[PDB]
Structure formats: C-alpha cells, structure tokens
Amino acid sequence: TGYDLSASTFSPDGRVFQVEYAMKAVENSSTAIGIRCKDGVVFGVEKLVLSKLYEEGSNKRLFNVDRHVGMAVAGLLADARSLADIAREEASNFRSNFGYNIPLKHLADRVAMYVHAYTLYSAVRPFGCSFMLGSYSVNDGAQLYMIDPSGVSYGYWGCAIGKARQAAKTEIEKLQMKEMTCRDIVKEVAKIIYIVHDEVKDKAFELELSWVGELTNGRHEIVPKDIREEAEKYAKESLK
Amino acid sequence: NQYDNDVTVWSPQGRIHQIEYAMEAVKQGSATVGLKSKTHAVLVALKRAQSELAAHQKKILHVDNHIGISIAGLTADARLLCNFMRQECLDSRFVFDRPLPVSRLVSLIGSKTQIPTQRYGRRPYGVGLLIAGYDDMGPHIFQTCPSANYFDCRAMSIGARSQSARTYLERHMSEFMECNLNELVKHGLRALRETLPAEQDLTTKNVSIGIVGKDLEFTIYDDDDVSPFLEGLEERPQ
Amino acid sequence: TQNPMVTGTSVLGVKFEGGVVIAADMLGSYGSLARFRNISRIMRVNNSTMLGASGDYADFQYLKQVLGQMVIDEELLGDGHSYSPRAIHSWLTRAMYSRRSKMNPLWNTMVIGGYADGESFLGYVDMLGVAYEAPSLATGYGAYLAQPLLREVLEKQPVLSQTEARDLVERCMRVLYYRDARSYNRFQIATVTEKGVEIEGPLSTETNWDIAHMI
Amino acid sequence: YDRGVNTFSPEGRLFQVEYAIEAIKLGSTAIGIQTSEGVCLAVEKRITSPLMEPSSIEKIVEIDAHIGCAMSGLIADAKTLIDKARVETQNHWFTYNETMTVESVTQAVSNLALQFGEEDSRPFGVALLFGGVDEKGPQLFHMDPSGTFVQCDARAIGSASEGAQSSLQEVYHKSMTLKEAIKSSLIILKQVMEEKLNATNIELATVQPGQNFHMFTKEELEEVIKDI
Amino acid sequence: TTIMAVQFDGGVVLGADSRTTTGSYIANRVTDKLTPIHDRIFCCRSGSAADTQAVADAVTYQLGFHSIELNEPPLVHTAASLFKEMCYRYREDLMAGIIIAGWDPQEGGQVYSVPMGGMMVRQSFAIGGSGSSYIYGYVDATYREGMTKEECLQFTANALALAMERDGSSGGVIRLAAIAESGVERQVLLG
Amino acid sequence: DLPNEQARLDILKIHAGPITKHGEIDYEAIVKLSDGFNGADLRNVCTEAGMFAIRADHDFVVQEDFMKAVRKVADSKKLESKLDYKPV
C-alpha cells in the first residue's frame, strides 16, 4: 500500500502506477480506429446508442483542431475536450506567430509535452485521454500520430483505441496502405467497424467517419454520412 | 477506501470516485424534465419544501432573453455557475452585439467545471443543469454533469427517481416532435406525475414550467399562470 | 502608433440590389513618395463579408492577422453558425475603441461590407471609434471628392443595379485619380453577392486631358 | 482520518457542511413569525451566571433601518456576516438611491456562504434569520451554512427547532395579527427555556411599515410578559 | 546604408555599401551590412545600427531554435514573420530598415521588405537606406524580368555605384553576395 | 527465458503432436500472438482453436477464425500475468 496513490512516487519494481491506471482507464471506452492512405487520412469512431439517449450528432468524439488537423478521442471525454481547447490554442499561437500552417510534428510535441507535464506533480492527475491526429499537406504528406495518456507520441500507418482494440487492429494488416485510394478506405474502415464490437454487448450503435486528405483539398471535415452511404451497403452484405 | 480520498487519485479500476460521489449529489435533487419539439423547448421542474410553512424552494431561474436552465443538487454552486452564465452571456452580447448560440455556451461550462475536477483541493460542482434556448437552428435541450460531459438529447430528466420519467418518455418520443405548446407541456409534466408516489398530488403550488420560443421570450410561470395548464389532465390509474 | 509610417489612401463602397461593391487602390505611400506599388488593401474575409482600409498599412496587416484567426475559430467549431458582418463590425468597433482609450491607437479608417439574409450591409469604423451605417461610404479624401457623386446619385434613385454601381465606382476612381496626389492609376474592385466574395483584378482608368491645349 | 476539507460523502454531499449543520443544534433558540402587519421575532439570551451583565449580549442587530436580523450558533462568526452585509446594503443604496430588497441581501451573503478551501478555511457556523419590510411587504427569511436560502413563514432554529416548529404549526394561521403573535411566541419560549422567564432572558424585535422604528427597548417587555 | 536585393531564376542577389555615418563624421569605412541569419537566408540592415543588430541577433536565436526543432531547412517567410513581429511590436523605439532575402528549397528565390512601420511585403527587387532615393529612377528603367546572374551582379554593381557616387552619406566599398543552392558566394567589388 | 524468432518454428513442431489442422497453413500467426506463455498455455491455444472447430462442424478451421480465438484468449491471460517479479 501507499505506492499507488500519488503520481510522483515510484513503485519499488520501478514503474508509476497512476500512469498505469491512466492507461487502462481508456481501455473501458469504445473502439475508435484510424488509418492513412497514400494521399489522405481516414478516421472512424463507433458510437454507442442504447435506447434513446441523445440526438444524432451529440458529443462527437471527432473534433477539428486546425484547418487541416483533427482529433479522434477515446477514453474519458471531458479532458479530451480540454486537450482539444489547448491544441486549438497552440495552433493559434503557431499560426499567429510564424505565418504558416502548423506541421503535425510540432503539434504532437507541444501537446505531448503537456500530457507529460501533468504526470510530474501531485498537484494534478495524469490525463485519461488518448487521441488520433490526422493531417495532409502537399509539402508534407499524410501523417498520423498517436498520443497516449503517458505522453508517448509516435507514428502509425494505422491504429485503434478502445475496448475492442487488439481485435480491431488485427485486420488492418490485411489492408494495403501504399496503393489504395482513401475513397475505398472509407468503406474499408466501415466494414470492420461494423464487424468489431459484436451486438451482444450493446444492442445498437452508430458510426462517425471523418476524412482529410488530397480530395478534400487540405480542409478537414466530416464526410456526409448520408452521401454515398457506402458503409452499411457493404456492411449488411459482409455478414456471410 | 484510501483511494476514495481526493480528486487527484485514480482508482485501480479506472473510475475516479469523487465524480461518482458528485453524481450521487445529482441524484439527490428533485425531479425535473426538459423536452423539445421542433418549434419549441419546454422544461418542467418539481419543487419541494422543507416544511408546511416554508415556501417551496424554486428550481427554474431566468438567465438570458432566450437561455434558461433548470437545476438539481446544490444551490450555492448553482448561483456560481449562474453568475458565470450571465457574465459569459453579456460579454459576447457586449462585444459582438448578437446573442450567443447555446452550443458554444456549454463548452465554457465544460471548460469552467473542468479545472476544479483535476487540480488538488478542488471539489467538482454538484450541478443539474438542463439548458434550453434558441440559436438560429431551433431549440436545444442539453444536460450537464459534474464530470463535465454535456449531452445533446431530445429529452432527459435528472433528479430523484427520474428513471421513471425516462421510461415514460421513450414510448412517446415518436410523438414529441410535431405538437404545439398546450399538449407539449402536459406531455412534459406527465413525466413529473410518474416521478411521484401515486397517492399524493400533483398540486398547483409546486410545479414550475419554463418555455422558450421564437415569438415567445423565456418565461417562468409560478402556480397561478400554471393553474391554466394543470386543468384537464387524466386520472392516475388504479 | 503616434505617427503613421507607410500609409494608403481612399476606399470607396456602395450598396446595390443583392450585394455591396468596394474598391480601393493598390498603392502604398511613404510621405511624398509612392514607395510600394503592389499591395492588396482589401481582405476577402470568409464568405459573406469584406474589409477595406486606409491609413497605416501595418495595423491593417495586424487586423488581417487577428480577424484571420478569429474567423477560423468559429470555422472550426462547426455548429453551423458564422459571424454576420453586423457582428464583425461591432467587434471591430470595440477593438478600435479599447485601444483608443490607452492613447495607443490603430491609425486606420476601415469599411466593412457584407451580404447576409438578403440584406446588404455597409459599415464604417474610424480611428477614434466612430461607427455608423450608410448606403455609401468613402474614406480619406473620398469623403471630400467621391462621396458627392454617391450622395448625388443615391438621392435621385436610391436602388441600384450591379452595372450602374460598378460603373459609378469607376467614375469616382477617375476623380480620385485626378485630384488626389497620393492615389495611383491602378485599382482593384471587390464585390460580395449571394454567390460569395469575389475580387476583380488590377484594373485601370482612362483619362481625359483635352484641357491642356487651353493655355 | 483527516481527509480533504472539501471532499464529498459516499451519500453524498459536503462532509464539512454536514458537520456544520450539527453546530446549529447546540446554539440558542429563536422564533420568527411573519405577520401581515409586520415581522415579530424572538430569541433567548441564555444567561450563564449572575456575574454577567444581561443587556450587553446581542442576538438581534438591526442591519439597515428597515431590515432586521437574528443570529444563532457561534456569535463571533455571525458578526463578520453582519458587518459585511451592512456594507452590501449601503453599496446598493449608493449606486442606486433605493432600499436594497430583503431578498437580495441573502443572495449577497449566501454567494459567499461557501468560500472555504486552501487556494482561491472552514464554512460558517451560523443560522441567520432575516426579517424586514421591502415594497413586497413584510418578508421573513432564513439562511443556513450551506447557502440554501429559502423563505420561511414562521421559522424556528437551534436546539428547540423540532418542538418549536412541531408545536408552532398548530398555533399559526394566515391572518395572524401582531400583538397576537408577540404573546404567541413567549408561550413557546417559556416552554423551551430552562431559566425562569423574566425581564432579562429574552428580547423581541418588530419591524413594520407603519410602526417604525419601533426598535427594542426595555419596560415594553415587562408589559409583554405580565399579559400571560 | 544603401542596400539592394534582386532575385533571379536560380536564387537572389544581395548588395550593400559599407560607409556608416554618425553625424557628419565617418566612424567606420567598411562594415558587414548584410548578415547571415541561416545558411540560405540573409538580411541587410538599415537605419539605426544597435537596433537592427539586436533584432537580427534575436531572430537568429528564434529561427535557430525552431529550425533545429523541425530538423528541416527553414522557409524564408518564417524568417520574415519574426521581423514583422519584433519590428511591429516595438515600433515606438526601433528604426529597422531590414530586407530579408534568400533562396529556399521549397519555393525558390524570395525577397521580403520590412520598412520602419513594420509591414511585410514581397518584392521582385528591393531597395532601402537613405541613399536609395537617388537610384529609384535607374532601378525603375534598367530593370527587366528574367535577368541572369551575370547581369544581376553588374546591375546591382552599377545601382550601388550611382548611390555611393551621389549621396554623401553612402560610400566606402560595395559588398555583394549571390545566393543559390550551390552556396553563398561573397565577394567585394569596387567601381 | 523466452524463445526467439525462427526458434518459434522449432518449439512449434513439438507442440504439434496429436492436434492436426488444415493442409495449407502457416503456424507463425498462431504462436506470435501469444508471447511469454506456458507450454501448456500455448497447448491450450491450440486446443481452444481446435474446440472452435466443433462449433463450425468442420475438422479444420481457416486461420482467420484461428487468430480470433488465439488473440482473444491470449490477451485475457496477460491481464492475469501480474506478480511475475521474483526476488533474486
């Protein structure tokens, strides 16, 4: 006892338990994945509807930090909105100061040093949020970064965050990043977001998809989920 | 239970207990029901009193020319987020010379009540807001929580035994969209008459009803302009 | 700024049916010298509003930066709302006046024109915080030279077409090329509509010099 | 287990506010009654010994001319709220040139009923009774340490609260007059006190639109008790 | 004093005089007016000397730290935005005649101007200092789009020869610098 | 200690034993998903994947349903792997 309470105390085996408890706090939240193609970044978040709870489009875990950068948060939600406001403000500082649009590398550093900066004191608690960062610029290419509650930021071609995490990142190695256009990769996400999280746990669900890349011309926005409706047209035909 | 101490300490299960205990402070407040149409928003509360002689403690308080909020739980913190609510309304009313839409107001409540849920020695706010107003795209019914997670619903209810209000609302959510005010309100407080035991009224001296509309500024009625609404309801079944 | 270093000149603007046309000229000046020949004194704000400016140009790049950020904020909210030009005019007034109150002013004179709800808007913000709405606005020596043509025509027939409005600004820029010492023979026309903000290219005026024979 | 001074309960509410409510129970009693003519009010001084001078003890201080008060529990905590509530009434009068209403006083106190913490110590241990006559008539009010402020028509507090309320709904109606209520309080007081009721134990306080002011002097109370 | 900055196809050409005037006395004949912020980005400074030295050193600091933190080559507009911020934020005291110029891999040759007011604008050719008022006319007529480097160095050579010739403040010796991908070549001509 | 790569194919051959599967297969997907496991635990993974065959009423199973039963059960064992630290 006594080694798990505060964040600033090492445990005798040599790890920090508040950080380890922060890692598996995101483990209870629902699955949200991401993947990049050769010219764009595709997001997808499965969202939970039990009976009535909310109007369609409530508390969307897809955010929009800059003109060309977006979030895909999973875990506890309020601190994820706090990181959305802070990363928003950091893009405002870089945009105001140095005159050009923020690269995804500096944004990953300046956010990840804050997420780390709340794991050094017993003033605060470590965050309980993990989020994706997708972007595209013609002098940059599509990058996809992944920030955990511990503060580690690095780069995937594809990732997954949630309960069904390993099962939802098992199948991504079947897909090919290098050749595919992202317009395929939309339904190529929605097929396994429909496949993972089988409906015995929760009766119903609802899907969000957000898509930035070359076709949207740098601007990040949600795809019109009604428009082309490619998800469930493949997904009801993907059970057999 | 040594990790039930403060807001800083995470659980070994991943559930920060001070937030759960503050949700328990939400459930101890009285019932209130907010529900919208496509053209209006109605939130109805139920007062309780300390004794017979003391007047019933009010819930619905006026905030802006279109924004109104219910409450359950603590009262002083409701005055605190009330004063912050007024001040962030008339800030942008002072600067931009337009009223604020609701959907960017509530992010100031989340980013306002966030920091007292993280740093040491700061309690969360025992709070029960049911926000209602107009932006240009119609009505909205939100709710808050001490964990600062705001939900865009079509109808909710928070307070003591408010789950019965929900299980009333789900079998009428397909019919709570087109109808105008006079049956929308009584469709509101039928959920309140299911939040009570079935052997006492449903009086006139306790229920308060607030409506926000397009050609109708946000208005609170109190027992006597309420008395034209409570007339003509069905009897509680055997 | 107590002393304006690199200044501009007059900005014009008028309502018409279905939008507001605003046209400044692309000169930057430095005292007597016409030093910078190719600058843009008109900022195309997002979809439904439009800004021109006179006076100091550096403070105009400052408000270009600040408005450039503050539009992108509500662009990234994405709730479906946006700043009406009526709402931008009030902010720009309150930001001009709160800096006026500390004796550190923004040496500018600006015209905000915008088109929302089928209602053409044309507002004015001075350096000292004066703000009003009018169907025809002119800055600098435009208030002494081109404003008489605008108030000449708008008292006779108050509604205007798009071609009459675009022609009238060409006439007033002929006058402001004639009698102003710090106005250059190269100007750009910008127009908002229900379609969106559109900036025409660096046009030119034709001149009449037939009085030079009369000695 | 001295934990966070600002920590919620398992029920749960504020631990230290819930502990603060029990501090009212060992304080002295009081009785307020709202009349259509005014507000009468009663308290007991609780003389501890014949050493003490009886009339220096204050349980009623009068906030404005037209807003009375009654304190309870720990008196030295109450004096701070008295002196600052007076400043808030005067600031209302010097921005506004009108009398601060009886309602907004208790918002102006109960907005800082909860300011304890470490940054930005303990909550107050008083239960006040505010009276007074604004334009809305004679109002009778009541505030707690929690700040949960409510109108009360005829409120008791303190140690005697249970028996005084419980006995007090029996003897109250809507059309009470003043001199009926004044002798209707001292019956309850002489039931609930431990010393013999006389000229040194209690003090009354009345405030009316047309009987003002009409404060609180001795030898009125001599006529008041002898009418029993 | 009299500075010069012309771009061409493969990069930019800079140039300045050296003679630094304090009062009616020359306390320094030959002086590095153009200054190496980074390996591909120059500024040549005008007006007060101490102000532009402190500003160029501070921009060298911030662009150095940022340029390492990317571990990529810096854009020229990244350098120009910092002079815009420092010159604009403190315009009540500073008198900076900075002209930022340099080749870039992403965008090619660029020349930005910063006058005393603190504004920032791109030019194809730029001129500053007190002496430039006497070569406005020659740089207007002799300039033509698409000059080669061997005509640009001749062109700024004559263009500073007139300003050093006529202005009593300007003088000393011509400093030149040609910037491209191949490397900065700094040489000293006279006449 | 733990085994290594291309040595995973070695310890595999002796864990084959009685349990057999489809003709065309690659066992590397099976054992790689379970790391730091008891020899009987990997032997359980082979039987757990083989007991999923009777639900599919087939003798063998494709390796797609294999990795499902392999990954799920394996990740469930890792949460129970606490207290592996031993004093020297």
What's the helix and strand layout?
This is part of a larger assembly, with chains A (240 residues), B (238 residues), C (215 residues), D (228 residues), E (191 residues) and F (88 residues).
Chain A lengths: L16 H7 L8 E6 L2 E10 L19 E7 L2 H21 L5 H14 L11 E9 L3 E7 L5 E3 L2 E4 L20 H14 L8 E5 L1 E4 L7 E2 L7 H6 L5
Antiparallel strand pairs in A: 1-2, 1-7, 2-8, 2-9, 3-4, 4-5, 5-6, 9-10
Chain D lengths: L14 H8 L7 E5 L4 E6 L24 E2 L4 H22 L5 H9 L17 E3 L2 E2 L2 E2 L2 E3 L6 E2 L9 H8 L9 H15 L9 E3 L15 H6 L3
Antiparallel strand pairs in D: 1-2, 2-9, 3-4, 4-7, 5-6, 7-8
Helix pairs in contact in D: 2-3
Chain F lengths: L7 H9 L11 H5 L6 H12 L12 H16 L10
Helix pairs in contact in F: 3-4
PDB class: hydrolase
Keywords: 26S proteasome, ATP-dependent protease, AAA-ATPase, peptide-unfolding channel, 20S core particle, hydrolase
Entry title: Nucleotide-driven Triple-state Remodeling of the AAA-ATPase Channel in the Activated Human 26S Proteasome
Describe the structure.
This is part of a larger assembly, with chains A (240 residues), B (238 residues), C (215 residues), D (228 residues), E (191 residues) and F (88 residues). The longest helix of chain C has 21 residues. Chain C is α+β, with helices and mostly antiparallel strands and 215 residues long. Chain C contains five helices and twelve strands. Chain D has a single domain, classed as Glutamine Phosphoribosylpyrophosphate, subunit 1, domain 1, CATH 3.60.20. With 228 residues, chain D is α+β, with helices and mostly antiparallel strands. Chain D is globular. In chain D, α2 packs across α3. In chain F, α3 packs across α4. Chains in contact: A-B, A-C, A-E, A-F, B-C, B-D, C-E. The interface between B and C is small, with 11 and 11 residues. Chain D: It is found in: Cytoplasm; Nucleus. Chain D: Keywords: Acetylation, Cytoplasm, Glycoprotein, Nucleus, Phosphoprotein, Proteasome.
